Write a protein that holds these residues in place. Structure first.
Motif, mmCIF file in Angstrom:
data_model
loop_
_atom_site.group_PDB
_atom_site.id
_atom_site.type_symbol
_atom_site.label_atom_id
_atom_site.label_comp_id
_atom_site.label_asym_id
_atom_site.label_seq_id
_atom_site.Cartn_x
_atom_site.Cartn_y
_atom_site.Cartn_z
ATOM 1 N N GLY A 202 -2.653 10.373 -1.981
ATOM 2 C CA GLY A 202 -2.317 9.168 -1.246
ATOM 3 C C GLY A 202 -2.276 7.942 -2.133
ATOM 4 O O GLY A 202 -1.407 7.820 -2.998
ATOM 5 N N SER A 203 -3.215 7.026 -1.918
ATOM 6 C CA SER A 203 -3.280 5.797 -2.701
ATOM 7 C C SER A 203 -4.579 5.047 -2.429
ATOM 8 O O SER A 203 -5.373 5.446 -1.577
ATOM 9 C CB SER A 203 -2.082 4.900 -2.383
ATOM 10 N N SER A 204 -4.789 3.956 -3.158
ATOM 11 C CA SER A 204 -5.994 3.148 -2.999
ATOM 12 C C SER A 204 -5.768 2.028 -1.989
ATOM 13 O O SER A 204 -6.521 1.882 -1.028
ATOM 14 C CB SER A 204 -6.421 2.559 -4.344
ATOM 15 N N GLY A 205 -4.721 1.239 -2.214
ATOM 16 C CA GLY A 205 -4.413 0.140 -1.317
ATOM 17 C C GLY A 205 -3.667 -0.983 -2.009
ATOM 18 O O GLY A 205 -4.277 -1.836 -2.653
ATOM 19 N N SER A 206 -2.345 -0.982 -1.878
ATOM 20 C CA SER A 206 -1.515 -2.005 -2.500
ATOM 21 C C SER A 206 -0.710 -2.766 -1.451
ATOM 22 O O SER A 206 0.159 -2.200 -0.789
ATOM 23 C CB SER A 206 -0.569 -1.372 -3.524
ATOM 24 N N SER A 207 -1.008 -4.053 -1.303
ATOM 25 C CA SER A 207 -0.317 -4.891 -0.332
ATOM 26 C C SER A 207 1.120 -5.158 -0.768
ATOM 27 O O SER A 207 1.388 -5.405 -1.944
ATOM 28 C CB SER A 207 -1.060 -6.216 -0.150
#
Length: 105
Positions: free
Chosen positions: A1-6
């Motif tokens: 998935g991913s960590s969190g990029s706005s």
């Protein structure tokens, strides 16, 4: 998935329209503003291709709009390819049917 990029917006979330896009003329500068009040942020690329070489000028005036202009030494249908943040929008490339203006003196 991913960590969190706005990052909101996206090509599709980008509209372009101007008094020059609809139509252009040979020897005359065709300006046009890009409506980017939808997408969050991203880069922009402009490439005018056709039967001849077209001039391009980019000058950042304000944060809202940039104002892009292009002159076609020769008449014809110049296909301006516009890519947003390295993505093709549903409105590009654009087809601006340029023609040589005939004035009577």
């Amino acid at each position: 998935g991913s960590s969190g990029s706005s990052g909101e917006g996206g090509a599709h979330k980008v509209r372009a329209g101007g008094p020059g896009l609809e139509r252009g003329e040979a020897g005359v500068p065709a300006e046009f503003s890009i409506w980017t009040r939808e997408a969050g942020a991203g880069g922009l690329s402009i490439a005018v291709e056709g039967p001849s070489k077209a001039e391009i000028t980019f000058d950042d005036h304000k944060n809202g709009s940039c104002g892009v202009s292009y002159i076609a030494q020769e008449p014809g249908n110049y296909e301006v390819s516009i890519k947003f943040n390295d993505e093709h929008i549903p409105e590009s490339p654009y087809l601006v049917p340029v023609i040589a203006p005939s004035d009577d003196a």
